[PDB]
Structures are given as C-alpha cells and as structure tokens.
C-alpha cells in the first residue's frame, strides 16, 4: 500500500478572512469522489486541518493533485474568488492560494 500526501496552503487569504478553511474542508468532504461516487471516502482519503489555514490530505488511492486543484478552483468559483485567487503548485504535492498581481491605479 502506497500513501500520498497533499497540502493546500490557504494561509494568506485565511488570515485575510477571504477564504473559509472549514467551509473548504466541508466542500472537499462532499465533493471528493472515490470510484466515481461522492461520499465514499472511508479510510482511503483523510482530510484534516494542520492549522495556519492549511488543509492536509492523506490518500491511499491514485488521487491526483490536478483533481485537488480542479476542486479548489471550483470552490473559488462558487465563492466568487476565481478572478482574484490563484492556485499555484510550489512543491511536490503543495498548492498555495495567492492573489493575482495587483497594480496601483
């Protein structure tokens, strides 16, 4: 059995009260599908909070960071943050949320 670890780092918008980490965790629990069916996590995917506005995922299947990024963008679109928040991979399995570049006008 292999185990993969994923970090979603929403520390800056979570500190800025832009991003709701608990709501994001609930969204992940109700939208991550296993074998094509939602609500089938069991012992294969565990989703938790390691604090500091970060969400940690343990997977024992072939769960993809591309799938996690797709679900994160779906949550940002639902929360009207898609035009303002960007999901960028920074390490192997670590995706952070950050503002797009801003110009003084």
């Amino acid at each position: 059995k292999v185990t993969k670890k994923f970090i979603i780092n929403a520390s800056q918008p979570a500190s800025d009260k832009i991003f709701d980490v608990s709501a994001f965790e609930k969204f992940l629990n109700e939208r991550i599908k296993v074998d094509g069916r939602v609500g089938n996590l069991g012992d294969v995917i565990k989703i938790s909070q390691i604090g500091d506005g970060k969400v940690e995922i343990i997977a024992h299947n072939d769960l993809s960071g591309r799938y996690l990024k797709y679900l994160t963008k779906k949550f940002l679109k639902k929360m009207q943050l898609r035009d303002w928040l960007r999901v960028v991979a920074t390490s192997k399995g670590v995706y952070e949320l950050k503002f797009y570049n801003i110009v003084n006008d």
Partner: protein, 73 residues
C-alpha cells in the same frame, strides 16, 4: 466568454486593478483596511562605436538629392 472565435486571455497575464479588487472584496464583506492591500499592490572607442551605430541607423550618411546645394535659401 467568446470561446467559439478566440480563447480567453489567462488571468495571470492581466494586472488586476486595486480599486476593482478592493470594491469586489468590499462587496464580499471583508475589511480591506484591516489587511492593507496598498502594501501588497505593486506599482572611449566602444562608446564612440555605439554612438556611431545609433547615428548610422537613425540618420542617413549622405543625401544625393541635396548635397550639391548648401544654404537655406
């Protein structure tokens, strides 16, 4: 969206205006002054030869039409 004729420019290629972003966050109901978006928002022979290159591209050396006549009148 105009995806039949052309693709959407990616969001990372466009600088987001601070006024619009602050307005959208104010619509969403957060304190922008408590987070401070102003701080986050961005804002010799060789020399003679280089001058000769610049002047060579800028100005033509001769003028066969008008080099035979001197004086403004």
């Amino acid at each position: 969206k105009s995806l039949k004729n052309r693709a959407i420019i990616p969001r990372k290629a466009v600088k987001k205006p601070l006024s619009q972003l602050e307005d959208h966050l104010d619509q969403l109901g957060v304190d922008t002054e408590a987070i401070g978006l102003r701080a986050r928002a961005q804002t010799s022979a060789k020399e003679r030869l280089a001058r000769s290159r610049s002047r060579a591209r800028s100005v033509a050396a001769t003028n066969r039409l008008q080099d035979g006549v001197q004086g403004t009148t």
